[PDB]
Amino acid sequence: GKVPHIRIENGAAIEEIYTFGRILGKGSFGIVIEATDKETETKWAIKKVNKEKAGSSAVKLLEREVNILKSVKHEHIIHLEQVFETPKKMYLVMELCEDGELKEILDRKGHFSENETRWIIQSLASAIAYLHNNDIVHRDLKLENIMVKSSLIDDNNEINLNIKVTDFGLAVKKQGTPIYMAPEVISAHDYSQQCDIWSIGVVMYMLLRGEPPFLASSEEKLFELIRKGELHFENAVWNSISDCAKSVLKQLMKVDPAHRITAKELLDNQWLTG
Amino acid sequence: KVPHIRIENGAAIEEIYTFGRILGKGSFGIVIEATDKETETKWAIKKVNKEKAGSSAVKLLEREVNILKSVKHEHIIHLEQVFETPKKMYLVMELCEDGELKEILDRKGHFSENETRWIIQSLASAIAYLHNNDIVHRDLKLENIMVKSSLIDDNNEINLNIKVTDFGLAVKKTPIYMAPEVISAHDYSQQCDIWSIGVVMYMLLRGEPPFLASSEEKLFELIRKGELHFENAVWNSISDCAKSVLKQLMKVDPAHRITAKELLDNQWLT
Ligand SMILES: CN(C)[C@@H]1CCN(C(=O)c2ccc3[nH]nc(C#Cc4ccccc4-c4ccccc4)c3c2)C1
Ligand SMILES: CN(C)[C@@H]1CCN(C(=O)c2ccc3[nH]nc(C#Cc4ccccc4-c4ccccc4)c3c2)C1
Known about the structure:
2 copies of one chain form a homodimer.
Chain A: E1 5-7, H1 11-15, E2 18-27, E3 30-37, E4 43-50, H2 56-71, E5 80-85, E6 89-95, H3 102-109, H4 114-133, E7 136-137, E8 147-153, E9 159-164, E10 172-173, H5 183-190, H6 194-209, H7 219-228, H8 243-252, H9 263-267
Parallel strand pairs in A: 1-5
Antiparallel strand pairs in A: 2-3, 3-4, 4-6, 5-6, 7-10, 8-9
The complex binds the ligand CN(C)[C@@H]1CCN(C(=O)c2ccc3[nH]nc(C#Cc4ccccc4-c4ccccc4)c3c2)C1 (2 copies).
One ligand A1AAY binds at residues 24-25, 27, 29, 32, 45, 47, 78, 94, 96-98, 100-101, 144-145, 147, 166-167 of chain A.
Family (chain A): Belongs to the protein kinase superfamily. CAMK Ser/Thr protein kinase family. CaMK subfamily.
EC number (chain A): 2.7.11.1
Active site (chain A): 140
């Protein structure tokens, strides 16, 4: 159905339901603690955001994030169980991803196999296609968002990652006189969703290589690499990676969003199927 | 700066001004002619009913007022006063007796090359002012360019003292994951005003928009291709310099589209 938005008056009201545990992350987003349902003994993750620390700006952001998490339902988009709201704090009860962020796993593993990247990108492709079909653009897809809920080494000694997309604070839902409108305005309005595709292309590069596709010593020097967008292969690791994977890479990071592949086209690509 | 005077009711502002005929009406509210009883000066007052519009539409007018307060330019509309009753908001602005430029163009048909140069020169100065102060209009069109006075010169050519209005849509403008079109949008957000100048100049010379179609999708395809057709009979009398600046103001890529400061320095305006 729909997510309950329970309005309570202090932390003890929500502590009647859940046992609060250790802290899993902290930043400008608030803090995320482990929690255990006293009734069902199920493990959850509770994101506490202090409404009084962050002004009306970050609170209006948090309200759209909650509104988007309420309406989405997908196997690889984080599940919002309930929302509790005191006058001071706001609590987001979500499914627990015990294995942490994908960025931490990549840094400890080095890089991933082509099949392991294939599975992760397929999950990303399905979730991003779901969001785009519902007029939702993530706008901030990166390895620090992709949570991992469970792991599985199969018989091929290849790891299967059950990933979960999080952080919808920057997300937006899609919707002047036309004779006066400029081409880049038409492109930005008609291709407002293609930034998620670029992010999928970037994360696929980092899973295969272990380094970002563009890196520099200054911000601008980095921006210039992005505009050129020259995907550099010839590296020592690419020949054992199929040509079919490099074609979909080139399709995911077309500099022009006009010919950048779409989410639905991605799902139909032979590299994710066969 | 402009004081934001909070008053009680409509009779209170009618103590200051004598209200006259209505000059415009729409979703933006209504614009009346008004005369200061004390000073005898005529102004244009935009009355906005804070419930007839709405909260989404009231915040628009709040940013327009904040932008009109900080700008000062001989071809940007002057905001004299802002009065606020609990039910309405009043913007006292300098009166442009001659109305909108779109109405003048439709009645006249098209303009001479010198008449267009005077209009575009004023536009170029005003848009260069805004860009130099990091402000983008984003909605420049013939329906915005107000005309305060007209003057026929010795050559039987009209001199238009224009005023830019409607700033409601104006803006005061992890990296490794960022997409190219976002960098392009963040770096070239101001060039749309330049494209609007090119459109306005084409319509003043030609009398028709540079891109027109029977459907929106066909219209967008024309715009993204950006093909400038100078084949009509009135282009034969238009100098090559005017067509060159037209092609520069309507470069499809905003990266290669001429800037406001470069426009002011172009040979056609000098
Ligand atoms: C600012 N963004 C980058 C962060 C990314 C995650 N963010 C969350 O809000 C969030 C929402 C729902 C969640 N379900 N399970 C989560 C977890 C976890 C975890 C497990 C082991 C070790 C570390 C973490 C961890 C990592 C980063 C941040 C918090 C915890 C989880 C996290 C915002
Ligand atoms: C919705 N945009 C397209 C319209 C464009 C003008 N807009 C104004 O708000 C505004 C602000 C300050 C102003 N000073 N003098 C003005 C005038 C006038 C006038 C004179 C004769 C005949 C008609 C008009 C006229 C035309 C259109 C709208 C209102 C009045 C004036 C107008 C919004």
